Design an enzyme around this catalytic site. Structure first.
Site, PDB file in Angstrom:
ATOM      1  N   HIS A  57       0.815  -1.211   0.000  1.00  0.00           N
ATOM      2  CA  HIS A  57       0.000   0.000   0.000  1.00  0.00           C
ATOM      3  C   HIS A  57       0.851   1.265   0.000  1.00  0.00           C
ATOM      4  O   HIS A  57       0.354   2.330  -0.388  1.00  0.00           O
ATOM      5  CB  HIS A  57      -0.924  -0.018   1.223  1.00  0.00           C
ATOM      6  CG  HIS A  57      -2.149   0.838   1.091  1.00  0.00           C
ATOM      7  ND1 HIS A  57      -3.083   0.664   0.091  1.00  0.00           N
ATOM      8  CD2 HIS A  57      -2.611   1.854   1.861  1.00  0.00           C
ATOM      9  CE1 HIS A  57      -4.058   1.544   0.242  1.00  0.00           C
ATOM     10  NE2 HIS A  57      -3.798   2.276   1.310  1.00  0.00           N
ATOM     11  N   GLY A 117      -0.558   5.285  11.149  1.00  0.00           N
ATOM     12  CA  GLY A 117       0.871   5.109  11.011  1.00  0.00           C
ATOM     13  C   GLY A 117       1.394   3.759  11.454  1.00  0.00           C
ATOM     14  O   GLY A 117       2.611   3.535  11.396  1.00  0.00           O
ATOM     15  N   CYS A 135       0.605   0.860  10.043  1.00  0.00           N
ATOM     16  CA  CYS A 135       0.668  -0.073   8.936  1.00  0.00           C
ATOM     17  C   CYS A 135       2.085  -0.600   8.799  1.00  0.00           C
ATOM     18  O   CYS A 135       3.046   0.170   8.839  1.00  0.00           O
ATOM     19  CB  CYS A 135       0.275   0.670   7.659  1.00  0.00           C
ATOM     20  SG  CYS A 135      -0.102  -0.377   6.238  1.00  0.00           S
TER      21      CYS A 135
HETATM   22  C1  LIG Z   1      -6.287   3.806  12.962  1.00  0.00           C
HETATM   23  N1  LIG Z   1      -5.531   2.685  12.429  1.00  0.00           N
HETATM   24  C2  LIG Z   1      -5.433   1.474  12.938  1.00  0.00           C
HETATM   25  N2  LIG Z   1      -4.653   0.729  12.134  1.00  0.00           N
HETATM   26  C3  LIG Z   1      -4.322   1.564  11.129  1.00  0.00           C
HETATM   27  C4  LIG Z   1      -3.451   1.186   9.991  1.00  0.00           C
HETATM   28  N3  LIG Z   1      -3.532   2.025   8.816  1.00  0.00           N
HETATM   29  C5  LIG Z   1      -2.537   2.870   8.597  1.00  0.00           C
HETATM   30  O1  LIG Z   1      -1.520   3.019   9.524  1.00  0.00           O
HETATM   31  N4  LIG Z   1      -2.511   3.616   7.511  1.00  0.00           N
HETATM   32  C6  LIG Z   1      -3.493   3.466   6.642  1.00  0.00           C
HETATM   33  N5  LIG Z   1      -3.434   4.254   5.427  1.00  0.00           N
HETATM   34  C7  LIG Z   1      -2.249   5.052   5.203  1.00  0.00           C
HETATM   35  C8  LIG Z   1      -2.426   6.433   5.179  1.00  0.00           C
HETATM   36  C9  LIG Z   1      -1.289   7.241   4.970  1.00  0.00           C
HETATM   37  C10 LIG Z   1      -1.066   8.669   4.897  1.00  0.00           C
HETATM   38  N6  LIG Z   1       0.209   8.847   4.679  1.00  0.00           N
HETATM   39  C11 LIG Z   1       0.853  10.142   4.541  1.00  0.00           C
HETATM   40  N7  LIG Z   1       0.852   7.688   4.613  1.00  0.00           N
HETATM   41  C12 LIG Z   1      -0.028   6.684   4.771  1.00  0.00           C
HETATM   42  C13 LIG Z   1       0.148   5.284   4.789  1.00  0.00           C
HETATM   43  C14 LIG Z   1      -0.974   4.503   4.991  1.00  0.00           C
HETATM   44 CL1  LIG Z   1      -0.729   2.748   5.007  1.00  0.00          CL
HETATM   45  N8  LIG Z   1      -4.488   2.617   6.841  1.00  0.00           N
HETATM   46  C15 LIG Z   1      -5.561   2.490   5.861  1.00  0.00           C
HETATM   47  C16 LIG Z   1      -5.272   1.338   4.885  1.00  0.00           C
HETATM   48  C17 LIG Z   1      -4.069   0.661   4.913  1.00  0.00           C
HETATM   49  C18 LIG Z   1      -3.850  -0.372   4.016  1.00  0.00           C
HETATM   50  F1  LIG Z   1      -2.684  -1.052   4.011  1.00  0.00           F
HETATM   51  C19 LIG Z   1      -4.844  -0.696   3.107  1.00  0.00           C
HETATM   52  F2  LIG Z   1      -4.594  -1.712   2.242  1.00  0.00           F
HETATM   53  C20 LIG Z   1      -6.048  -0.022   3.066  1.00  0.00           C
HETATM   54  C21 LIG Z   1      -6.259   1.011   3.960  1.00  0.00           C
HETATM   55  F3  LIG Z   1      -7.429   1.696   3.971  1.00  0.00           F
HETATM   56  C22 LIG Z   1      -4.518   1.879   7.944  1.00  0.00           C
HETATM   57  O2  LIG Z   1      -5.432   1.139   8.139  1.00  0.00           O
HETATM   58  N9  LIG Z   1      -4.848   2.746  11.287  1.00  0.00           N
END
Ligand SMILES: Cn1cnc(Cn2c(=O)nc(Nc3cc4cn(C)nc4cc3Cl)n(Cc3cc(F)c(F)cc3F)c2=O)n1
Ligand SMILES: Cn1cnc(Cn2c(=O)nc(Nc3cc4cn(C)nc4cc3Cl)n(Cc3cc(F)c(F)cc3F)c2=O)n1
Lengths: 302, 301
Positions: free
Chosen positions: A41, A143, A145
């Site tokens: 991702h 953050g 992920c």
């Molecule tokens: C609240 N929470 C609980 N677990 C998570 C995990 N999570 C995450 O850390 N980040 C996600 N989206 C990103 C946004 C970004 C913005 N920037 C600047 N960089 C980013 C990197 C990421 Cl990965 N997501 C959402 C998400 C991550 C995926 F790997 C996916 F396949 C689908 C998704 F909707 C996320 O859930 N957050």
């Protein structure tokens, strides 16, 4: 003495955590030898995240588009490939802190330790179970992920989980380290529901044995039950069926306490039908299902 | 609830755990720079453990009587002294894995991460709270004596607990890293009962703030109270009185939610006097008292 959700010491995994950035998208990666593993991702812009065509996106990337940071030192990416939902960045430096390790795919009901990380920096450690519906009830913020789950046997780290996303219900979904999701999920920013969750019966029984070992027997009774009659009631309450293999795995706890497995089943049947009447077990007002028989044996043997 | 006990990453402490042996008596020690800290109980033989004369036992010991091992590697002891209930063994090697660290003495209600260790080998990590009766509800087996508890703030490890013993109720007692016991306990193998415990009011309030942050706020009432009136009522329900420091550590959560600390105290007072009437808070019918205000800020932000 005592019983607590206990994680493995995380030091062997802390030395493997790095930050991976592509454009402005950033998350955690796992540096073993000369490869960094992370969720693919990371290659998505905010627009791509809604509906990514990953092969199309990855073919348009060059090695220099990947910024890998270990602490503050940058690791030069010299090659990249994708295995299912895991990106594999080859770097020009082997991690000197690489532990002995294996990648494994765990089964529902098994437990593992999660090292929650943010921007490549470890933040906290805790134990979780893989739910029967293949979600995990984790504790994760934005953050996280790319954070990993693992068990440690001797000095070998068995990595079993890479965190990817939070679902609308607040439970979590991720992959093994070969990039295959646990459960019917996809790595896309779209609302995804899980299948109906069920309770890990063998784990509840293990935790009841933990309670007896720690001196609480209020829930025991003189009724007994057959395996099939127990399973009929368990299924009615959305508990997983108990197999003879589970009965065998509970053998050491049954031997230690002197309580036959089917006698403990009769106790659990009464708890399901009667509730707990405001009482607690090991401090909990609910029946806990995230301790395996081995989790109990390792904390209560002796 | 979404909340769970989370421990600090333990790597910085794992690199400091050693084994200390005197004769056959063996436990865990903490290697920082060129000193190993461990419970002085290690100098007891089996017959000394019941009623030890530590000054007499220590004068009979010399440096060469102490076996300190990092794994199977022996660290030569070049000096020894006793500080309260902790032995300090000067060794000939400074630990290259020593983190930035401090020794702190915590108050009841404060939480910390325990690295349970056996024979100098780290085994597991979990979070605990110091109870008002100066015990912890840990998980410890034989061989865990000398395991440490700690917090980590910006690369600095604050060590706050060294495990000594299990009490008759299965709860645990220990010292700070200067060897002073938490509570009225002594380091001898005698049955020592913990006093009656109470509920950690400041942490229950933190938990209520966490509920409000998450939109679960049915328990907020239209009342306020004075701190003194609340403290007098709380004690009637086996709750700890609040200190001025407790009011201040609730500051950030009060500002985040806009709910004054004394308004939250009045809401808690109504829960104590009336119960919850079949409702739940964060999905629980029990009021959780082992998350501090810092823990809440850590898991929510
Ligand atoms: C609240 N929470 C609980 N677990 C998570 C995990 N999570 C995450 O850390 N980040 C996600 N989206 C990103 C946004 C970004 C913005 N920037 C600047 N960089 C980013 C990197 C990421 Cl990965 N997501 C959402 C998400 C991550 C995926 F790997 C996916 F396949 C689908 C998704 F909707 C996320 O859930 N957050
Ligand atoms: C079940 N449990 C939970 N916590 C503990 C901690 N604990 C411990 O690990 N060991 C203890 N006694 C020793 C016996 C030894 C036998 N050999 C060969 N070596 C030994 C070393 C020790 Cl420390 N104790 C008991 C205990 C330890 C003290 F430090 C103390 F001051 C009083 C005590 F009664 C113990 O509680 N076990």
């Amino acid at each position: 003495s005592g019983f607590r959700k206990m994680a493995f010491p995380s030091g062997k995994v802390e030395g493997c955590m790095v930050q991976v950035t592509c454009g402005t998208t950033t998350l955690n990666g796992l540096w073993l030898d000369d490869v960094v593993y992370c969720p693919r991702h990371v290659i998505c812009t905010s627009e791509d995240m809604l509906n990514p065509n990953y092969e199309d996106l990855l073919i348009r990337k060059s090695n220099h588009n990947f910024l890998v940071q270990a602490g503050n030192v940058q690791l030069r990416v010299i090659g990249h490939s994708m295995q299912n939902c895991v990106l594999k960045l080859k770097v020009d430096t082997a991690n000197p802190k690489t532990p002995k390790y294996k990648f494994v795919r765990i089964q529902p009901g098994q437990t593992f330790s999660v090292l929650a990380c943010y921007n490549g920096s470890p933040s906290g450690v805790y134990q979780c179970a893989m739910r029967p519906n293949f979600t995990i009830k984790g504790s994760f913020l934005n953050g996280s992920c790319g954070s990993v789950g693992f068990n440690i046997d001797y000095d070998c780290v068995s990595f079993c989980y890479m965190h990817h996303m939070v679902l609308p219900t607040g439970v979590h979904a991720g992959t093994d380290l070969e990039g295959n999701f646990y459960g019917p999920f996809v790595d896309r920013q779209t609302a995804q529901a899980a299948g109906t969750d069920t309770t890990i019966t063998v784990n509840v029984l293990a935790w009841l044995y933990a309670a007896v070992i720690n001196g609480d027997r209020w829930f025991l009774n003189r009724f007994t039950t057959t395996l099939n009659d127990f399973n009929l009631v368990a299924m009615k309450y959305n508990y997983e069926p108990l197999t003879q293999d589970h009965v065998d795995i509970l053998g050491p706890l049954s031997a230690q306490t002197g309580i036959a497995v089917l006698d403990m089943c009769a106790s659990l049947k009464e708890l399901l039908q009667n509730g707990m009447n405001g009482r607690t077990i090991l401090g909990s007002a609910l029946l806990e299902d995230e301790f395996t028989p081995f989790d109990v044996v390792r904390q209560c043997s002796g």
